[PDB]
Write a protein that binds this DNA or RNA. Structure first.
Ligand code: MG
Ligand code: ZN
Ligand code: ZN
Lengths: 64, 102, 103, 214, 137, 101, 82, 91
RNA sequence: GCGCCGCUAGAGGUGAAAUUCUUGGACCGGCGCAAGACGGACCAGAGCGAAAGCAUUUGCCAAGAAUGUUUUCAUUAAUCAAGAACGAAAGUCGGAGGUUCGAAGACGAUCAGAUACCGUCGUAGUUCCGACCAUAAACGAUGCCGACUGGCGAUGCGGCGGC
């Protein structure tokens, strides 16, 4: 229920998505171990190697 | 014009084959026109592997696979893009596409 | 019900072609009380006290009783004729082994 | 307003004495309030347990059933009900370009435990075999299938239920129809697929309490 | 202290959990080892107010949260998984709320034992509700 | 007794109360099926030939099988005289004047 | 192969055709002598035999009819004649 | 000879009662007036007495059968399942 | 579908939704039982059949091709007006049965309109026995019998020979 708002550094950017070229898949790593790594998506421009903070950490990836 | 040498179907020495039914739209197709696809998908959704093996009651658990045979009418095989419309001379090969697993 | 009931009714017609026998109730009754009948055959249709005493003299003559699974019109055609026969006794088989079968 | 989980209590479920691990798990049942006593509410509960959490090393794709037949206070004593395989194993071993043969037979023990045995078997591709289809012919199928059901009709009608269910913790039946059929056609995935229960012999209470002894 | 089993620190009790993850809904019903005494059934359609999202994976995510936050609240601590599809006459692949109901059941504090797909597969029976040309959307 | 025969059996001439000596499904072609024994509060249900399911006693005595004479309503009466002889043996009800006329 | 001398074939090519379709047709059968173990009586049994042939005095089974060419029963002395 | 061509046994009703009603009767009528092979003696002597009552000219044995035919197929379906339930589970 | 338990307010169905089912406790989970259908995966450019067609196990009955044959008879053959035999599904008449599906019809939608697509229900029908009808994109859109005229690998059934 209550999650810590957890921050995460990105490895390789997986190219644009989102049907308008608006969303970027980024594959974050959770700052505490590099073994735990989910693929997620942000909007706005990325700069590989930076830090972004997940308001809730694990929801879904882009697959049908 | 006759388009294909076999008539889209793999029957030669018969008169009649069984009708089976399409998976998504439930349409009556013969067993040898139907586009078959056998799926050996792991049931664990490989993103969710290192979240259950730490929650496991073992140290090395063999995760079960899921074995579901799909088969399609070709009006829903083309729309779902499991087969693709091909050129008139790249049609005469029955070899499957490559795998490309890693 | 598929392959091999031509052990009973095909060895029975072989005796019919070759060997010696009697058909009918009271002919077997004569043959079984003077010992000359080697094997008596009863049909499924035969009345229950007629069956009970044909078995009873073969207990006395020390001969075998076979219960042919079939009608008496079925046992008559299995003989190869247009009668209906519940009870027969083969008294000299030709060369087949109805006696040296299962009983 | 009322909580239905306060009127309940947790019993614990035991295995027959022929298994290594004896304590299966912990079921629960309501307490007695008048008519519904706490001993008919959990008779005939089937506990689908596998070998791997019931033996020290044995495989996970084989499960058993274990009906409840007695309550001895907190203890909940079980007796054999049937087995089958897990379905992931069952359709990993169904592959193309091989003949699948199956047999079934209704055999009762010397203990009065009429069973129905389901066995499968799959024809084997050889180690220098170049041709793709390792199919058997139909008269080879029929004499394998006669050989399959003849062997298990022996080794269940031999003696009581106890040595029969103890026979297929290691599944020496599937090894037996393996070795005795491969001079007809070689087979490679030969399991007793399912055991189904047809009769119960009167529930002698002494026979069950033999099964939870030493 | 009428609620809870008799367990120590180290020992855990098992109950089976049925993931009926079809389309149009998902069930994360959990029960005892015999499967006869229901411990906690909650449904993804009971925690959305949308009716599109009964079969969402986000509905199955927080339904699996609630069923684990009640299971551990009782005293049952580890779960067998008995995932289903619709099976039988209909489709035999599970729906979208299968994997999210399984992973949310693992991230939110619960141990996992034997897992198995248990959907009904027939020996060719029971003609299917489509007609002969199927359904034509 | 119906408490001893297993489920799905075909029964004619069954008692609707114990001792009644046979009341239900007595006409030609008729039968009743037993379903759903209840060993506690000893009472079984049956399926009457009108499709009504009805719970009865466990000890209602009943004869296994279907009544002889079935198929009797498959042949037409086919002329007015054979309906005359049909009801001459039963009652006085057959030439029925319409109340409209 | 425009110049196969198809009136004088090699006997290697002549052997490995059908018993019809040859330049001159001829059978694949023969006659064979069989010493049953324990008698003087050479039997002159046919190769592709069809009946169960028995010996005269030592009246055990001699050969068994099967699909094409007769399975002899005992490993017994044997020679192809003429 | 072929004295009639379609009506057969129901030529005795003549031009009366309809076309389908006469065609409905001539199936039932050739069935209650037939001589059936006796299962008890083998002679084709089973003649129908009153409705439901079937009797032998020889061996004199009375069988409770169907209304218009000797074996109602609803009744034979019962006997196949009664002996199934008898041997299976043994009550 | 119906019993008997368990826990709970929804379940169902759609691109959406609704008609509909539901605290006289539905769906869901368990144990049972009944009934009628249907034989999955193995199942293939594999087999058999004159064609239509034929797939659960064992088992009475009759048939059949191919192969093997230094057996037999010695042109007994080919195609065929007339005249017949069988022939999917639907359909008709009659009796059993009636689970599922489902023309017709009823409703809910979607729609400018919906006598359609989609959804809920559902009659005949679909299953069996008996009697009819004799038509299909009954298609390999290629009549049957006979011979000759390239190659190569493979397959199914026989027969023969070899590490
Ligand atoms: Mg009137
Ligand atoms: Zn489709
Ligand atoms: Zn008689």
């Amino acid at each position: 229920r209550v999650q810590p708002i957890k921050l995460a550094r990105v490895t390789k950017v997986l190219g644009r998505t989102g049907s308008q070229g608006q969303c970027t898949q980024v594959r974050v790593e959770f700052m505490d171990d590099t073994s735990r790594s989910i693929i997620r998506n942000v909007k706005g421009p990325v700069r590989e190697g930076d830090v972004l903070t997940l308001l809730e950490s694990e929801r879904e990836a882009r697959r049908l | 014009t006759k388009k294909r040498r076999n008539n889209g179907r793999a029957k030669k020495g018969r008169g009649h084959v069984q009708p089976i039914r399409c998976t998504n739209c439930a349409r009556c197709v013969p067993k040898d026109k139907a586009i078959k696809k056998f799926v050996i998908r792991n049931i664990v959704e490989a993103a969710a592997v290192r979240d259950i093996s730490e929650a496991s009651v073992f140290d090395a658990y063999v995760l079960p696979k899921l074995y579901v045979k799909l088969h399609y009418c070709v009006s829903c095989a083309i729309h779902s893009k499991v087969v693709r419309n091909r050129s008139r001379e790249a049609r005469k090969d029955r070899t499957p596409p490559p795998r490309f697993r890693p | 019900t598929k392959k091999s009931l031509e052990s009973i009714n095909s060895r029975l017609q072989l005796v019919m072609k070759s060997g010696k026998y009697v058909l009918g109730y009271k002919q077997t009754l004569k043959m079984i009380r003077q010992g000359k009948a080697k094997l008596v055959i009863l049909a499924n249709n035969c009345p229950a006290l007629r069956k009970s005493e044909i078995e009873y003299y073969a207990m006395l003559a020390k001969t075998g009783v076979h219960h042919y699974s079939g009608n008496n019109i079925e046992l008559g055609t299995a003989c190869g004729k247009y009668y209906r026969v519940c009870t027969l006794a083969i008294i000299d088989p030709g060369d087949s082994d109805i006696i040296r079968s299962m009983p | 307003v009322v909580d239905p989980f306060s009127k309940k209590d947790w019993y614990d479920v035991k295995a027959p004495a022929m298994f290594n691990i004896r304590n299966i798990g912990k079921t629960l049942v309501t307490r007695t309030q008048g008519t519904k006593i706490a001993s008919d509410g959990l008779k005939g509960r089937v506990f689908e347990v596998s070998l791997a959490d019931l033996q020290n090393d044995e495989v996970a794709f084989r499960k058993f059933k274990l009906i409840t037949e007695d309550v001895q206070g907190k203890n909940c004593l079980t007796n054999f009900h049937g087995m089958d395989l897990t379905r992931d194993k069952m359709c990993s071993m169904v592959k193309k370009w091989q003949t699948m043969i199956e047999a079934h037979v209704d055999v009762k023990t010397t203990d009065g435990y009429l069973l129905r045995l389901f066995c499968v078997g799959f024809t084997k591709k050889r180690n220098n075999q170049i041709r793709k289809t390792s199919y058997a012919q139909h008269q080879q199928v029929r004499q394998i299938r006669k050989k399959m059901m003849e062997i298990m009709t022996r080794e269940v009608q031999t003696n009581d239920l106890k040595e029969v269910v103890n026979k297929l913790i290691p599944d020496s039946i599937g090894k037996d129809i393996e070795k005795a059929c491969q001079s007809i056609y070689p087979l490679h995935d030969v399991f007793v697929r399912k055991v189904k229960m047809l009769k119960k012999p009167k529930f002698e209470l002494g026979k069950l309490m033999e099964l939870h002894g030493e | 202290i009428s609620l809870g089993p008799q367990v120590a620190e180290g020992e855990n009790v098992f109950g089976v959990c049925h993931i009926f993850a079809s389309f149009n809904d998902t069930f994360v019903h959990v029960t005892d080892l015999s499967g006869k005494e229901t411990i906690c059934r909650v449904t993804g359609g009971m925690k959305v107010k949308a009716d599109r999202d009964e079969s969402s994976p986000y509905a199955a995510m927080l339904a699996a949260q609630d069923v684990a936050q009640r299971c551990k609240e009782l005293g049952i601590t580890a779960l067998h998984i008995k995932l289903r599809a619709t099976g039988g006459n209909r489709t035999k692949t599970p729906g979208p709320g299968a994997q999210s109901a399984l992973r949310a059941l693992a991230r939110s504090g619960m141990k996992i034992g034997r897992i198995e797909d248990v959907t009904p597969i027939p020996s060719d029976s029971t003609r299917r509700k489509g007609g002969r040309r199927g359904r034509r959307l | 007794p119906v408490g001893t025969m297993p489920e799905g059996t075909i029964v004619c001439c069954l008692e609707e109360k114990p001792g009644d000596r046979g009341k239900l499904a007595r006409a030609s072609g008729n039968y009743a099926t037993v379903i759903s024994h209840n060993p506690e509060t000893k009472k079984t249900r049956v399926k009457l030939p009108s499709g009504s399911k009805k719970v009865i006693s466990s000890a209602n005595r009943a004869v296994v099988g279907v009544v002889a004479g079935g198929g009797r309503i498959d042949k037409p009466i086919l002329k007015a005289g054979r309906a005359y002889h049909k009801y001459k043996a039963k009652r006085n009800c057959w030439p029925r004047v319409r109340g409209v006329a | 192969p425009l110049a196969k001398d198809l009136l004088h074939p090699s006997p290697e090519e002549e052997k490995r055709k059908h018993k019809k379709k040859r330049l001159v047709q001829s059978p694949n059968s023969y006659f064979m002598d069989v010493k049953c173990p324990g008698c003087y009586k050479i039997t002159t049994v046919f190769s592709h035999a069809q009946t169960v042939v028995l010996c005269v005095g030592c009246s055990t089974v001699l050969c068994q009819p099967t699909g094409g060419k007769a399975r002899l029963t005992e490993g017994c002395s044997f020679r192809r004649k003429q | 000879a072929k004295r009639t061509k379609k009506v057969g046994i129901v030529g005795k009703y003549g031009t009366r009662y309809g076309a389908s009603l006469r065609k409905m009767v001539k199936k039932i009528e050739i069935s209650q007036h037939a001589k059936y092979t006796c299962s008890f003696c083998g002679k084709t002597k089973m003649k129908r007495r009153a409705v439901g009552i079937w009797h032998c000219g020889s061996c004199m044995k009375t069988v409770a059968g169907g209304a218009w035919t000797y074996n109602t197929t609803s009744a034979v379906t019962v006997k196949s399942a009664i002996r199934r339930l008898k041997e299976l589970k043994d009550q």
